[PDB]
Write a protein that holds these residues in place. Structure first.
Motif, short mmCIF file in Angstrom:
data_model
loop_
_atom_site.label_atom_id
_atom_site.label_comp_id
_atom_site.label_asym_id
_atom_site.label_seq_id
_atom_site.Cartn_x
_atom_site.Cartn_y
_atom_site.Cartn_z
N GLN A 247 12.68 -52.33 25.72
CA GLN A 247 12.32 -53.48 26.50
C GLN A 247 12.09 -54.08 28.19
N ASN A 248 12.83 -52.81 28.41
CA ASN A 248 12.29 -53.75 30.27
C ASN A 248 11.66 -52.39 30.58
N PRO B 94 15.44 -51.44 22.23
CA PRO B 94 16.08 -51.24 23.53
C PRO B 94 15.41 -50.98 24.07
N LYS C 42 7.89 -57.77 19.67
CA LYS C 42 8.30 -57.73 20.42
C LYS C 42 8.91 -57.07 20.17
N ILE C 43 9.56 -56.71 20.98
CA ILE C 43 10.54 -54.82 21.76
C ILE C 43 11.23 -55.08 20.37
N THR D 86 7.40 -58.64 26.75
CA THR D 86 7.93 -59.89 27.07
C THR D 86 7.86 -60.67 27.83
#
Ligand SMILES: [Mg+2]
Ligand SMILES: [Mg+2]
Ligand SMILES: [Mg+2]
Ligand SMILES: [Mg+2]
Ligand SMILES: [Mg+2]
Ligand SMILES: [Mg+2]
Ligand SMILES: [Mg+2]
Ligand SMILES: [Mg+2]
Ligand SMILES: [Mg+2]
Ligand SMILES: [Mg+2]
Ligand SMILES: [Mg+2]
Ligand SMILES: [Mg+2]
Ligand SMILES: [Mg+2]
Ligand SMILES: [Mg+2]
Ligand SMILES: [Mg+2]
Ligand SMILES: [Mg+2]
Lengths: 47, 105, 154, 150, 143, 97, 93, 192, 67, 64
Positions: free
Chosen positions: H22-23, H19, H15-16, H28
Motif C-alpha cells: 500500500q505505501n 496492505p 487498487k492495492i 494510489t
RNA sequence: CAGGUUGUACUUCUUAGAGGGACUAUUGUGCAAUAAGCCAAUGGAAGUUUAAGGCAAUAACAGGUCUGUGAUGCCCCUAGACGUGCUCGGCCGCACGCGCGUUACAAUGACUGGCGCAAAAAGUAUUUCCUGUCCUGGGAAGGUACGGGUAAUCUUAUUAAUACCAGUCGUGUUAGGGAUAGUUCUUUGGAAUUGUGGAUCUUGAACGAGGAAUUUCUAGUAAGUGCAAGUCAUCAGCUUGCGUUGAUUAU
C-alpha cells in the motif's frame, strides 16, 4: 592613440609579467638595503 | 553649451581598487552642476585561468594549481565640457588601474 | 514488393559474376558487395547507371542485367562515372584508368608488391618481411602475428 | 482564417513543398547531384531520390525563419556527426556545392533575395514579398487540412 | 508614461530559462514563437499541458500567454516552459485579481507538483583533476 | 615588521659567522620587538656537518593555516652562499591586527 | 552454405528458420486477407513469428493490410509496430 | 477530470488489495496520476524518497540500465508505452493493473544472508522487506527482458510486454523473473 | 504451491545484525487466519520502517541476539 | 555533525553573560543585538553564536 | 507572426555591485543528570558542518627532481671539448611480458532524411589571430569579391552531440565493427617518404559480451554524449575544464 590596442587580458598579463620583471631586477641588484616591493603606476606618459 | 559625451573606462586586476574609483567618480560627478552621468555600469567579469601541474619534476601523484586573475571593467558615461572631466579625474586612484576616455558630441 | 509469380524458376537464388563472385538473394546493391571490387556505395552507383531497381531484391535481374555489370566494370568510365570514384587511377606511369575487378585486383597487387620487391623500397621491403608500413608502432601492436597487410575474406 | 509556417511542424511542411517544386519542376537537378555524392562525409548515398527537392524545400523554410543565414552556417545548421572510427565523433560541416546551388535556384524562383544593405552579411539570402507568400499558402493549406482531421 | 496590462513570469531548470508573458485575451500559447503542439519531444509536450489541465480550460481560455525559452536541453526547457506557465497564471491573479484567487491556484499546483513553482535547485557539479570526471578517477592497480 | 628585510639581516649575520641560534634569536627578538604578533625562522641546510638538517626557531603566535594565512603573514626566503653548498633561510613574520 | 569462422561452438543448436523474401501470386492474396492468423497483436516480430517473413517484407504486408482498411495502427516507432486487426481475430480456418 | 496514463489508462482502475504494498507503490496517490512517466523528480534524496515514485517511472529507470546502449530515459519511456499497448491488446486489461500485479508477485519473500566463518560459507533465514521486495521485483522483470531481447528481432516493448504478463500469472516457465523469485526462496528455504 | 503465508507487521525495529551490517532485526505482530497477535522477533534484510507488513513463510522461528 | 567550536560557545556564553536582560527568545532579534554588541568578523559565524546563544536563553528559562 | 524605430520608459529575463538569507529554526520521541548532541516531521532556494574546492600542524619518508632555474658544494670535459652549430639518423626499432586508455561485439541497433534546444572557454603589429557574408570546387579545400573585432560590441546569443519524427536494412561476424592495405586529390612545413592531418573508391581482420583476478562510484553523482582550453606550423586516442540526456542500490 597609443600604438597598438591589446586584449585587456593580453595587456594585463603583460602588465603583471613586467612587474615581476622589475621585481627580479631590483631585488637582485638592490641586495644591500632592505628591499621590499614596488608600487608601479604606469601612464602612457610616465612609468 | 558645448556638451561632450565622455566615456570613462576602468579596468583593473582586483576589485578592491576599481570599485573605489567607480564609487568616487560618480560621487564627484553628481555633485557638479554641468554634469550628467549614466550610472556606473559593470561589464561581465573576465577571468583568466591557468591550471598548472604543481611539482617541477613529474613525480608523485597528480597535483594541479588552479590560478586565477580577475579583471573587472566598469564603464561610466558623462555629459560635460572638456574642463569638467579633468576636474573630476582629480582623484588619488590606486596603482594598476587603467582609465581610458572617449569624447564625442 | 516481393509479389513473385513463378517461384522456383521466376527467380534465381545465385547469379554468377566475375569468376567466383556468387551472389546472395536479399537486396541487389548490397548483394554486389561480395565482389572483390564493389562496395556499400559503389553498388548504389551501378543501379543508377543501369537504371536497375535498388530497393528490389537480388537476382530478379536477367543475364542482361548481369553483363550490364561485367562490362560496366570493364570500361566504367565509358558509361560515365567520374574518374574519382574508381578503385585504381593512373597505373604504371601509363595505363590511364580501371576499376579493380574481383580477379583483376588480386593480381594487380601481386604485381605492385612485385614492383616494389625488386625496387627494394622501405615500404616495399616492409610488405615482404610482413609488417604494417604506415602503422609504425611495433611494441604493443599486432602481436601473435595478427593480420598483416592486404586482406582477403574467407 | 489563415496560418503561417510557424503554425505547422515543418517536418510536415517540407513534405509538402518538396512536391510543389516537383509538379512545377521549376528547378533542374544539377549534374554532380544524381551523380551520387552524399552530403558531407558519411556512409551510403541518400536513399530518397528527390533529396534534392527536399533540401531546397526546407532551405526555404530555414531562410524564411533565419534571414541572412549563410552558406557555411547552413552547412553546419543541417546537423551532422562523423564516426571517424577509433577517434571519437566530431561535428561535421556539410556540402557547399549542393547548398549554394539551392540558394541560387530559389532566387531565380523569386523567393530568395540577396540583401545589398546590411554591411555585415552583404548578399545574404532573405525571403521576398512574393517568395514568402507562396510559403504561407502551402502552410495554410496544410494548416486547414490539419484542422480538417475532425 | 505607459502601463500595459501584463505579467512577467520566469521558469528555470539547469540553465533552462522561460520568459513567460501573460496578457488578457482568448487563450494563446506561444513558446519561443509557436504553438505548444510543436515542441521537440512530442512526449514531454504533455508535461506542459499538465498545469493547463490541472486548473481548467477556464483560466487558459480567458488569457493570451506568450513564452520564449532558450534554456539548455530539450527536456529542461520543457521544464521551464512549464514552470513559467504555472508561475505566470498565479502571478497574473496576484496583481490583476483577488489575492485570494492566487492562493487557490498556488496550492492547487503545489499539491500536484512543486516543479511548477519551486525551482529545481541542482545544477551541474564541476570536475576534479583527481580523475577523468566529476567524481570518477584514473584506475589504481594495487596487487 | 618587514620579513623581506629581516632575512637579509639574517643573511648578513650568517655570513659573518654568527652561530645559528644566537643569530635567529637576535632577528626574532628584534622582530617581535618591532611589534610582530608572532615570528618564526627556518634554516634548512648542511648545518655544521654531513647530512642535511632543518633548524626551526619560533616565538609567539603564528598562523600556520587558513585563508588569513597570507593576510597576517609575511614570508621571504633567501639562499646564502657558503663554500659549503647552500643555506636556506625562511622568515615568517606574523603582522599585528 | 556455412563458411563463418569460430562461431559454431558448444551451446545452442537452433536452426535459423529460413524466412523468405518472395511470395507467390498463389498465396499473395490468401495471406493478406488472413491477419487473424498472427495472434491478436501484430508487430514486426509476430508477423515473422508465424509466417517466416522478415520484417522489411512483413511491413509491406502490414502497410498493405493497413491500406485495405483491414488493420489499424496502435503505435509506430523505430522497430516497434503495433497493429490491431479491426473487428477482432475471429479466423480459425 | 482524471488524467489517464499515456492518455488512455485510468489509474483508479486499480487498487492495492494487500496492505504490504500500500505505501510502497505509486498507483494510489493524486500526485501519482501522471500522463507522462517523466518527472525528473528528486527521489533518491532522503532515505525513502524512492517510495513516492510513480511505479512506472521506476520501471523506465530500471529499464535504461545497460551501459553504452542506455542512459537516455527519452526512449525508455517509449519502450514502456508500446509495451503497455501490447499488453492491452492481449488481455485488454488496464495494463497497470497487470504490471502492478506482476510487481507484487515477482518479489521474493525470503532470501539467505551469506555469513561465513573462517572459510566455511554458511547462510541463514531472512525475510525480505517490502521496499526491497518491489525493487527486486522490477529489477528482476526487466533483467530478464534483455536476456532474450538480445540477438532477437523480438523487441524490448515486446519482450517486456510478454514478461509483465506471465510475471502476473506466476507462470514459473515463462518469466526469467519469477524463476529466481521461486529459486531464491527455495534455495533460501534450504539454507534456513 | 500451497504455502501458509501469515501476514505480520513490524512492532519495533530492534537493531542491526550480521556483521554484513545490513540485516535488520525486528519485533513483529501478526494478522492472519492461523493465529494472530503472536509476537515474533524476526530477521529482515532491506528497507524497513515501523509498521510495515511482511509475509512470513514460517511462523515457527524468531532467532535473536542483542550484544 | 552540528557541534560548536569552543569560540562559538564562548561568545554565546559571554554575550549572554553581559546582556542577559536585553537578549530575547528570538534569534533574529538577538542576532541583530550580537552584531551591534561586538566584533564578529564572519557574518555567518555571527549567527552561529546567536543561534546557539539563543539556545542557552531557553535553557536558562529553566535555570540550570 | 516575423522586421524597423522610438522613448532622459522599465527591470522579470542578462550583467554585477551593495545588502539580505541558515543559525541547524519550530514541533515531538531517543539521549538525558543538567548536557553535548542524535532522530523525524513542517516551513524552506537552500539543512550529509547546504554542495564542490583552496588553504593545509609536529615529525618524517637517507621519496623525487642538480635535464627548469644566472640556486649552488664537490667531481668530471676543455678546441679532432660533455661548449657551441650544421647535415643526416634516433628516441615510434620487434619473438614477447606489463599499465593507463580508444573503438566494439549491434535492433534499448546501424544507415538516409528532417528537426531554431546548450555551456565554457579562447581570438591580431600590415594579410600574419577568431572568422561572418559572397564566389569556385564532388570533395577535403580553395579565392580574395564585401566585412566586424585587439571584444557582453566582431566570429554569437548562435554550428554541439546524445534525444525526438519519418524512411531503408531485418539476425544474416551481414558490416554491426572498423584494424590492414592500394592507387588518386587536398591542406601544414625548406623537407613528410619510417603513411603529419584531412577527402575519394576499394580492401574488410579479431570481436559474438570476455577465466584467476581487479578499479573507481551514492545525485544533476555513475553512464552516455558532444564542446572547449593546454600542447600546437601541422598531429589527439592524453590532460584540464564545460554543458546536454540522465537511472539501479544504499544512507
Ligand atoms: Mg541523423
Ligand atoms: Mg628539504
Ligand atoms: Mg534509433
Ligand atoms: Mg567543506
Ligand atoms: Mg605538507
Ligand atoms: Mg633542481
Ligand atoms: Mg664536437
Ligand atoms: Mg575560407
Ligand atoms: Mg569559435
Ligand atoms: Mg543494409
Ligand atoms: Mg572508410
Ligand atoms: Mg605513401
Ligand atoms: Mg590515418
Ligand atoms: Mg568523453
Ligand atoms: Mg588552434
Ligand atoms: Mg586542440
Amino acid at each position: 592613440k597609443t600604438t597598438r590596442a591589446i586584449n585587456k587580458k593580453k595587456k594585463f598579463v603583460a602588465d603583471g609579467v613586467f612587474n615581476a620583471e622589475l621585481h627580479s631586477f631590483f631585488s637582485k641588484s638592490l641586495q644591500d638595503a632592505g628591499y621590499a616591493g614596488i608600487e608601479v603606476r604606469r601612464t602612457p606618459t610616465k612609468t | 553649451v558645448k556638451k561632450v559625451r565622455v566615456r570613462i573606462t576602468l579596468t583593473c586586476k582586483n576589485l578592491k581598487s576599481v570599485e573605489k574609483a567607480t564609487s568616487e567618480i560618480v560621487s564627484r560627478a553628481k555633485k557638479t552642476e554641468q554634469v550628467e552621468v549614466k550610472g556606473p555600469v559593470r561589464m561581465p567579469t573576465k577571468t583568466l585561468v591557468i591550471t598548472v601541474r604543481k611539482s617541477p619534476c613529474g613525480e608523485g601523484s597528480k597535483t594541479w594549481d588552479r590560478f586565477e586573475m580577475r579583471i573587472y571593467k566598469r564603464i561610466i558615461d558623462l555629459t560635460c565640457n572638456v574642463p569638467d572631466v579633468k576636474t573630476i579625474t582629480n582623484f588619488r586612484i590606486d596603482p594598476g588601474v587603467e582609465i581610458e576616455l572617449t569624447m564625442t558630441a | 514488393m516481393s509479389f513473385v509469380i513463378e517461384k522456383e524458376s521466376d527467380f534465381k537464388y545465385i547469379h554468377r559474376i566475375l569468376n567466383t563472385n556468387i551472389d546472395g538473394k536479399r537486396i541487389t546493391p548490397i548483394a554486389l558487395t561480395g565482389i572483390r571490387g564493389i562496395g556499400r556505395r559503389f553498388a548504389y552507383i551501378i543501379c543508377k547507371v543501369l537504371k536497375i531497381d535498388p530497393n528490389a531484391r537480388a537476382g530478379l535481374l536477367t543475364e542482361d542485367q548481369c553483363n550490364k555489370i561485367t562490362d560496366l566494370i570493364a570500361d566504367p568510365e565509358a558509361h560515365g562515372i567520374p574518374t574519382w570514384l574508381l578503385n585504381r587511377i593512373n597505373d604504371f606511369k601509363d595505363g590511364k584508368n580501371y576499376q579493380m575487378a574481383s580477379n583483376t585486383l588480386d593480381t594487380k597487387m601481386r604485381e605492385d608488391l612485385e614492383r616494389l620487391k625488386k625496387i627494394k623500397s622501405h615500404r616495399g621491403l616492409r610488405h615482404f618481411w610482413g609488417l604494417k608500413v604506415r602503422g609504425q608502432h611495433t611494441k604493443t601492436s599486432g602481436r601473435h602475428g595478427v593480420v598483416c597487410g592486404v586482406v582477403r575474406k574467407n | 482564417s489563415f496560418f503561417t509556417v510557424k503554425d505547422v511542424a515543418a517536418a510536415d511542411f517540407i513534405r509538402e513543398y518538396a512536391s510543389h517544386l516537383k509538379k512545377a519542376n521549376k528547378l533542374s537537378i544539377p549534374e554532380f547531384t544524381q551523380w551520387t555524392t552524399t552530403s558531407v562525409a558519411r556512409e551510403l548515398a541518400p536513399q530518397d531520390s528527390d533529396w534534392v527537392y527536399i533540401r531546397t524545400a526546407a532551405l526555404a523554410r530555414k531562410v524564411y525563419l533565419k534571414p541572412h543565414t549563410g552558406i557555411s552556417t547552413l552547412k553546419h545548421i543541417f546537423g551532422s556527426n562523423k564516426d571517424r572510427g577509433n577517434l571519437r565523433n566530431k561535428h561535421q560541416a556539410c556540402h557547399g556545392k549542393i547548398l549554394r546551388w539551392a540558394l541560387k535556384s530559389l532566387e531565380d524562383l523569386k523567393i530568395i533575395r540577396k540583401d545589398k544593405n546590411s554591411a555585415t552579411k552583404k548578399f545574404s539570402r532573405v525571403i521576398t514579398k512574393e517568395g514568402m507568400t507562396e510559403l504561407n499558402r502551402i502552410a495554410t493549406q496544410i494548416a486547414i487540412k490539419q484542422r480538417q482531421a475532425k | 508614461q505607459q502601463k500595459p496590462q501584463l505579467v512577467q513570469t520566469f521558469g528555470r531548470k539547469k540553465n533552462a530559462v522561460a520568459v513567460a508573458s501573460v496578457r488578457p485575451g482568448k487563450g494563446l500559447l506561444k513558446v519561443n514563437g509557436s504553438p505548444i503542439d510543436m515542441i521537440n519531444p512530442q512526449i514531454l509536450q504533455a508535461k506542459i499541458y499538465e498545469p493547463i489541465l490541472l486548473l481548467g480550460q477556464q483560466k487558459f481560455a480567458n488569457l493570451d500567454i506568450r513564452i520564449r525559452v532558450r534554456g539548455s536541453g530539450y527536456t529542461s526547457q520543457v521544464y521551464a516552459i512549464r514552470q513559467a506557465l504555472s508561475k505566470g497564471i498565479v502571478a497574473y491573479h496576484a496583481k490583476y485579481v483577488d489575492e485570494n484567487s492566487k492562493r487557490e491556484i498556488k496550492e492547487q499546483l503545489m499539491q500536484y507538483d512543486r516543479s511548477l513553482l519551486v525551482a529545481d535547485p541542482r545544477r551541474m557539479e564541476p570536475k576534479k583533476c583527481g580523475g577523468r570526471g566529476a567524481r570518477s578517477k584514473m584506475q589504481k592497480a594495487y596487487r | 615588521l618587514c620579513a623581506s628585510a629581516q632575512v637579509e639581516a639574517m643573511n648578513y649575520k650568517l655570513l659573518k659567522d654568527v652561530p645559528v641560534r644566537l643569530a635567529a634569536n637576535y632577528i626574532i627578538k628584534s622582530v617581535i620587538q618591532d611589534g610582530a604578533k608572532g615570528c618564526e625562522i627556518i634554516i634548512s641546510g648542511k648545518l655544521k656537518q654531513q647530512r642535511a638538517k632543518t633548524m626551526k626557531f619560533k616565538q609567539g603566535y603564528m598562523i600556520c593555516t587558513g585563508q588569513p594565512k597570507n593576510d597576517y603573514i609575511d614570508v621571504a626566503v633567501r639562499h646564502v652562499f657558503f663554500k659549503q653548498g647552500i643555506m636556506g633561510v625562511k622568515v615568517k613574520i606574523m603582522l599585528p591586527y | 552454405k556455412k563458411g563463418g569462422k569460430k562461431k559454431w561452438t558448444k551451446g545452442k543448436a537452433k536452426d535459423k528458420v529460413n524466412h523468405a523474401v518472395f511470395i507467390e501470386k498463389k498465396n499473395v492474396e490468401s495471406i493478406i486477407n488472413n491477419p487473424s492468423k498472427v495472434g491478436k497483436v501484430l508487430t514486426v516480430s509476430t508477423v515473422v513469428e508465424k509466417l517466416k517473413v522478415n520484417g522489411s517484407l512483413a511491413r509491406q504486408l502490414m502497410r498493405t493490410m493497413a491500406d485495405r482498411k483491414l488493420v489499424e495502427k496502435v503505435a509506430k516507432n523505430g522497430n516497434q509496430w503495433v497493429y490491431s486487426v479491426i473487428g477482432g481475430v475471429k479466423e480459425d480456418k | 477530470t482524471q488524467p489517464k496514463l499515456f492518455g488512455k489508462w485510468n489509474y483508479d482502475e486499480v487498487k492495492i488489495q494487500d496492505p504490504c504494498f500500500q505505501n510502497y507503490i505509486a498507483c494510489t496517490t493524486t500526485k501519482s496520476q501522471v500522463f507522462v512517466p517523466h518527472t525528473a523528480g528528486r527521489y533518491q534524496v532522503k532515505k525513502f524518497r524512492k517510495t513516492q515514485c510513480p511505479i512506472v517511472e521506476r520501471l523506465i529507470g530500471t529499464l535504461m540500465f545497460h551501459g553504452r546502449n542506455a542512459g537516455k530515459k527519452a526512449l525508455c519511456i517509449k519502450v514502456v508505452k508500446n509495451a503497455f499497448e501490447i499488453i492491452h491488446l492481449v488481455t485488454g486489461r488496464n495494463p497497470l493493473e497487470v504490471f502492478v500485479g506482476a510487481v507484487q508477485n515477482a518479489g521474493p519473500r525470503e532470501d539467505s544472508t551469506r555469513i561465513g566463518t573462517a572459510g566455511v560459507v554458511r547462510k541463514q533465514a531472512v525475510d525480505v522487506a517490502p521496499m526491497r521486495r518491489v525493487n527486486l521485483a522490477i529489477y528482476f522483470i526487466i533483467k530478464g527482458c534483455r536476456e532474450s531481447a538480445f540477438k532477437s528481432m523480438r523487441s524490448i516493448a515486446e519482450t517486456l510486454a510478454d514478461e509483465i504478463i506471465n510475471a502476473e500469472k506466476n507462470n514459473t516457465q515463462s518469466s526469467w523473473a519469477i524463476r529466481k523469485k521461486d529459486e531464491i526462496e527455495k534455495v533460501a528455504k534450504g539454507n534456513r | 504451491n500451497t504455502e501458509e503465508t501469515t501476514k505480520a507487521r513490524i512492532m519495533d525495529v530492534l537493531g542491526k545484525t550480521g556483521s554484513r551490517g545490513g540485516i535488520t532485526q525486528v519485533r513483529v505482530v501478526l494478522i492472519s487466519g492461523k493465529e494472530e497477535g503472536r509476537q515474533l522477533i524476526r530477521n529482515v534484510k532491506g528497507a524497513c520502517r515501523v509498521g510495515d507488513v511482511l509475509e512470513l513463510m514460517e511462523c515457527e522461528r524468531e532467532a535473536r541476539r542483542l550484544r | 555533525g552540528r557541534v560548536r567550536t569552543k569560540t562559538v560557545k564562548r561568545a554565546a556564553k559571554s554575550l549572554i553573560e553581559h546582556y542577559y536582560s536585553k537578549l530575547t527568545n528570538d534569534f533574529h532579534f538577538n542576532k541583530k543585538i550580537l552584531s551591534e554588541v561586538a566584533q564578529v568578523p564572519s557574518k555567518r559565524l555571527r549567527n552561529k553564536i546567536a543561534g546557539f546563544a539563543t539556545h542557552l536563553m531557553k535553557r536558562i528559562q529553566k535555570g540550570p
